[PDB]
Write an enzyme that holds these catalytic residues in place. Sequence first.
Site, short mmCIF file in Angstrom:
data_model
loop_
_atom_site.label_atom_id
_atom_site.label_comp_id
_atom_site.label_asym_id
_atom_site.label_seq_id
_atom_site.Cartn_x
_atom_site.Cartn_y
_atom_site.Cartn_z
N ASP B 135 0.88 -1.20 -0.19
CA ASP B 135 -0.11 0.06 0.11
C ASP B 135 0.84 1.32 -0.08
O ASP B 135 0.46 2.27 0.66
CB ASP B 135 -1.18 0.03 1.36
CG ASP B 135 -2.05 0.93 1.03
OD1 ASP B 135 -2.36 1.28 -0.03
OD2 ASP B 135 -2.87 1.30 1.82
N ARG B 139 0.06 9.07 0.52
CA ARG B 139 -0.82 9.23 2.13
C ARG B 139 -0.31 8.38 3.11
O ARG B 139 -0.59 8.60 4.20
CB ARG B 139 -2.27 8.97 1.93
CG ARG B 139 -2.40 7.23 1.17
CD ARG B 139 -3.81 7.08 0.71
NE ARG B 139 -3.87 5.69 0.47
CZ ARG B 139 -3.87 5.06 -0.88
NH1 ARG B 139 -3.51 6.00 -1.65
NH2 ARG B 139 -3.77 3.78 -1.14
N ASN B 140 0.59 7.32 2.66
CA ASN B 140 1.19 6.53 3.57
C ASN B 140 2.70 6.55 3.93
O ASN B 140 3.21 5.79 4.18
CB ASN B 140 0.87 4.97 3.43
CG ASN B 140 -0.50 4.45 3.52
OD1 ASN B 140 -1.18 5.16 4.55
ND2 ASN B 140 -1.00 3.50 2.95
N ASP B 153 2.00 1.86 7.36
CA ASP B 153 0.90 0.97 6.94
C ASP B 153 1.20 0.04 5.95
O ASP B 153 0.57 -0.22 4.98
CB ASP B 153 -0.43 1.85 6.44
CG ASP B 153 -1.22 2.71 7.52
OD1 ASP B 153 -0.75 2.42 8.66
OD2 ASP B 153 -1.91 3.33 7.10
N1 ANP Z 1 0.93 8.45 12.65
C1 ANP Z 1 0.18 9.48 12.14
N2 ANP Z 1 0.30 10.65 12.73
C2 ANP Z 1 -0.50 11.55 12.14
N3 ANP Z 1 -1.37 11.38 11.26
C3 ANP Z 1 -1.47 10.13 10.72
C4 ANP Z 1 -0.73 8.92 11.27
N4 ANP Z 1 -1.35 7.58 10.77
C5 ANP Z 1 -2.24 8.21 9.77
N5 ANP Z 1 -2.51 9.75 9.77
C6 ANP Z 1 -3.48 10.26 9.10
O1 ANP Z 1 -4.64 9.59 9.18
C7 ANP Z 1 -5.13 9.58 7.57
C8 ANP Z 1 -5.99 8.37 7.58
O2 ANP Z 1 -5.02 7.37 7.90
P1 ANP Z 1 -5.41 5.82 7.08
O3 ANP Z 1 -6.49 5.41 7.78
O4 ANP Z 1 -4.18 4.86 6.99
O5 ANP Z 1 -5.90 6.36 5.63
P2 ANP Z 1 -4.88 6.42 4.31
O6 ANP Z 1 -3.65 5.93 4.79
O7 ANP Z 1 -4.97 7.95 3.80
N6 ANP Z 1 -5.55 5.40 3.07
P3 ANP Z 1 -5.02 3.65 3.50
O8 ANP Z 1 -3.68 3.58 4.46
O9 ANP Z 1 -4.80 3.34 1.75
O10 ANP Z 1 -6.13 2.64 4.02
C9 ANP Z 1 -3.93 9.57 6.97
O11 ANP Z 1 -4.26 9.91 5.53
C10 ANP Z 1 -2.95 10.64 7.81
O12 ANP Z 1 -3.30 11.95 7.20
O1 9LL Z 2 -1.06 0.49 12.86
C1 9LL Z 2 -0.98 0.89 11.72
N1 9LL Z 2 -1.06 2.38 11.36
C2 9LL Z 2 -1.50 3.36 12.42
N2 9LL Z 2 -2.09 4.49 11.70
C3 9LL Z 2 -2.44 5.55 13.09
C4 9LL Z 2 -2.06 4.84 14.27
S1 9LL Z 2 -1.56 3.21 13.78
C5 9LL Z 2 -0.55 -0.05 10.68
C6 9LL Z 2 1.10 0.07 10.72
C7 9LL Z 2 1.63 1.02 11.76
C8 9LL Z 2 3.10 1.18 11.58
F1 9LL Z 2 3.81 2.01 12.43
C9 9LL Z 2 4.15 0.22 10.86
C10 9LL Z 2 3.33 -0.78 9.55
C11 9LL Z 2 1.73 -1.00 9.78
O2 9LL Z 2 1.18 -1.77 8.76
N3 9LL Z 2 -1.07 -1.51 11.32
C12 9LL Z 2 -0.11 -2.31 11.97
C13 9LL Z 2 -1.29 -3.70 12.21
C14 9LL Z 2 -0.95 -5.06 12.71
C15 9LL Z 2 -2.31 -5.97 12.89
C16 9LL Z 2 -3.48 -5.85 12.29
C17 9LL Z 2 -3.67 -4.41 11.55
C18 9LL Z 2 -2.57 -3.23 11.61
C19 9LL Z 2 -2.36 -1.89 10.82
O3 9LL Z 2 -3.28 -1.35 10.39
MG MG Z 3 -2.40 4.85 6.24
#
Ligand code: ANP
Ligand code: 9LL
Ligand code: MG
Lengths: 280, 288
Positions: B135, B139-140, B153
């Site tokens: 992915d 955005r990631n 992610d």
């Molecule tokens: N660790 C973080 N700190 C700050 N903002 C964050 C963080 N992780 C995610 N976000 C924000 O949260 C939004 C939504 O998160 P997320 O659910 O992963 O949607 P997405 O990444 O944009 N689409 P996808 O990851 O393909 O499902 C992101 O687009 C960022 O703007």
């Molecule tokens: O937690 C994640 N993202 C978040 N955004 C805001 C807060 S956390 C994401 C993830 C975080 C990271 F630091 C590095 C790689 C990643 O794949 N993970 C981990 C995981 C484990 C078991 C089931 C689902 C997920 C899942 O979605």
């Molecule tokens: Mg994301």
Amino acid sequence: ALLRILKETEFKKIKVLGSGAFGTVYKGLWIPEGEKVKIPVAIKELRNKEILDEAYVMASVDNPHVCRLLGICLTSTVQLIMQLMPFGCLLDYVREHKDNIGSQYLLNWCVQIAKGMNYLEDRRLVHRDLAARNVLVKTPQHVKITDFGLVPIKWMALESILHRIYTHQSDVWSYGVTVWELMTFGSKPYDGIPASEISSILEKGERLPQPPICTIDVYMIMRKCWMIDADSRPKFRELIIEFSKMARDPQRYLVIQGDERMHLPSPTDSNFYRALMDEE
Amino acid sequence: QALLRILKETEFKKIKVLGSGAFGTVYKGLWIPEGEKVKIPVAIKELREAPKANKEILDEAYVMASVDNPHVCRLLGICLTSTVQLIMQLMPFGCLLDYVREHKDNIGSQYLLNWCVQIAKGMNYLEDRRLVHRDLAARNVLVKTPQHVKITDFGLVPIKWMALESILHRIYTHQSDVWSYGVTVWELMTFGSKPYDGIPASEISSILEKGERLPQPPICTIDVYMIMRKCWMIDADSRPKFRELIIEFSKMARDPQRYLVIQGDERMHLPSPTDSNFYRALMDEEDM
Ligand SMILES: Nc1ncnc2c1ncn2[C@@H]1O[C@H](COP(=O)(O)OP(=O)(O)NP(=O)(O)O)[C@@H](O)[C@H]1O
Ligand SMILES: O=C(Nc1nccs1)[C@@H](c1cc(F)ccc1O)N1Cc2ccccc2C1=O
Ligand SMILES: [Mg+2]
Ligand SMILES: Nc1ncnc2c1ncn2[C@@H]1O[C@H](COP(=O)(O)OP(=O)(O)NP(=O)(O)O)[C@@H](O)[C@H]1O
Ligand SMILES: O=C(Nc1nccs1)[C@@H](c1cc(F)ccc1O)N1Cc2ccccc2C1=O
Ligand SMILES: [Mg+2]
């Protein structure tokens, strides 16, 4: 170089955190220009532009247990910016945890404060205000010395009260009082005794009482810091070795009830704390 | 291993909503260490659908809690409630996509190429750990500071970022990740434009076999666009390797104005050491 000259439009004072001998500390926000983010900072507003030269010294310290001055704003009232410690100072910390500390935490703090004070000695900076209130808690496992290099009679060596001579051996004295604060869980030294009389009671050879949790091994170290002969009290380098020795067998040198279930953080918790607020 | 902290409720609180993604919603949250009076900011991702299922969620959580690279985000903790909640460090600058949109044209060529290097470094690390991102997109890619980005992610539908062999078959490879890396670079160079804008996702599969790719960004010289196109070749094994991309983008980043033609690239603020030390002491104490 390591001191960033800020302008007043880049930061905001929010809440007052406290006042000390020289300055008032605010919780603030740094507003990087062109950005929409607000970063928390600590601001000390004090009560000669050459002050810039003094600021450069505190921006140049490099030690895990010594706080660094990050920025300064001189347009009006001198304002100084450093990293904000959400746990506050160690004095307030140990009072609020009077029941749950543990020997392992206490002895390690003594090691860390000694390491910081030895670093300041190597750089030939005399603290002149070491006390539990000037030791900041970054995390409970990591403390840092602040407000160094710049009214507090109860932490000063006898040679500082009578004559105004602050040395690294005078800092050793205040280090001894700082340990006493920790070991008594934040008690006030010489409580009830006016500062005017402390000069006189020290020459009669009276010191702070033995903390109830301290074995004599640790109390001898503390008393050794309070010897009238400055050159006979311990060196900071020796304090690191002694307290490090005691930290490898903590329950032998500190008698705390329930000391077995309130010990050092688990590696999982350490990794969580470190990733969240202490990556250095 | 065992770098994943199992958190319990009442130890953290969700405060503000940041966004939603494919499976889950990300909140700004506060960690309240038990026995303490402190509020630590964190990011919380609450999944979308609530047993035995959480034993594999836990198994992946341990893997994502174990990555160690300056350009790869680490899962810090997990909470095993009805809906699983995930804890990582909060990046106050947000994702790189929104960042580059809010700074469209206000970004220097030096910044753009460095991000490409860092994303490649992180993606090469994931290859070294034999983890498929599946992915990668702007955005990631989270912005810790403007000079420091991190991949998130990874290792767990986005048709316009997927390689052709991933659309016509659920085959995700490190070479398919190279494809999405090319789409991510295109996002950056177009300052956050939507890829294949106007073409329905159902129809993206067909235009790729006919050989249509993303257009050349107006700021990209021919050298930078040629790397991008090599990432999208139908032959997976003909696409660049991530370490080769690191070498290529590092070369261009040493002379950015030779490879990116940006209006006002001479008035475009570059990272000064005084500002770097200030950013790092406040929010980026990690090694790099
Ligand atoms: N660790 C973080 N700190 C700050 N903002 C964050 C963080 N992780 C995610 N976000 C924000 O949260 C939004 C939504 O998160 P997320 O659910 O992963 O949607 P997405 O990444 O944009 N689409 P996808 O990851 O393909 O499902 C992101 O687009 C960022 O703007
Ligand atoms: O937690 C994640 N993202 C978040 N955004 C805001 C807060 S956390 C994401 C993830 C975080 C990271 F630091 C590095 C790689 C990643 O794949 N993970 C981990 C995981 C484990 C078991 C089931 C689902 C997920 C899942 O979605
Ligand atoms: Mg994301
Ligand atoms: N960087 C910081 N982050 C968080 N709290 C801080 C910080 N610096 C200072 N404080 C708090 O502010 C209080 C008062 O600051 P200060 O002006 O240093 O007075 P003091 O240190 O307690 N007495 P003094 O030694 O005479 O300065 C301290 O006791 C701390 O609780
Ligand atoms: O600013 C300080 N403390 C603060 N508390 C909240 C925010 S800043 C204090 C200080 C900070 C530090 F990180 C390390 C050692 C220190 O001595 N300094 C520095 C300085 C320079 C020139 C004139 C007066 C002072 C002065 O008082
Ligand atoms: Mg102080």
